[PDB]
Prior knowledge:
It is found in: Cell membrane; Golgi apparatus membrane. By secondary structure, the chain is of the alpha/beta class. It has helices at residues 16-25, 75-79, 81-92, 115-125, 140-152, and strands at residues 2-9, 39-46, 49-57, 65-71, 99-104, 129-131. β5 (99-104), α4 (115-125) and β6 form a beta-alpha-beta unit. The chain starts with a strand and ends with a helix. A 6-stranded mixed β-sheet has the order 2-3-1-4-5-6, sandwiched between helices. The protein is built from 5 helices and 6 strands, in the order βαβββααβαβα. The site of phosphoaminophosphonic acid-guanylate ester (GNP) has 18 residues, from α1.
Amino acid sequence: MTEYKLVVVGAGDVGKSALTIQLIQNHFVDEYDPTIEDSYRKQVVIDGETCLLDILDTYMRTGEGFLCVFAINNSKSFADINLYREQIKRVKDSDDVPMVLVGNKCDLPTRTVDTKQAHELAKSYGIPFIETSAKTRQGVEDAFYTLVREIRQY
Ligand SMILES: Nc1nc2c(ncn2[C@@H]2O[C@H](COP(=O)(O)OP(=O)(O)NP(=O)(O)O)[C@@H](O)[C@H]2O)c(=O)[nH]1
Ligand SMILES: [Mg+2]
């Protein structure tokens, strides 16, 4: 089965680890839980085609698709997205790389990132935007499956 090398990036504490651990282990994780592990591999079926997700929970040169994650309660994490995107562009030597913008922690009752700004940022990039919660599992499978679809269409 084809392997898809997925890389999860974004500012500190945005939920990169917790997004991946929710997908794999069906558990919302916090600081009292281990988030040391490098990579996670998981057999899935996406669009009736089996595949293996090889997920690196942050070298990036080999990655085939990237989740750029910010937290909707951390404006600086959203401002920093452009920095991660430019980093990925540099190491992949490409203006366009399979990539999904993830606004995580969408369970929280409050927020500091205007959602309309997130849609427009992603539109300027030409990439999907997905709102996720590692806590409730909202958007989690969609974020990763959407990235795989982006890679297949590259
Ligand atoms: N409410 C809420 N809290 C979340 C969500 N995702 C992560 N958190 C919380 O945010 C904190 C950071 O989570 P973590 O997964 O370690 O983020 P990280 O980006 O991997 N951090 P690091 O860059 O240091 O590895 C933890 O307390 C975690 O429980 C979410 O979707 N909703
Ligand atoms: Mg982490």
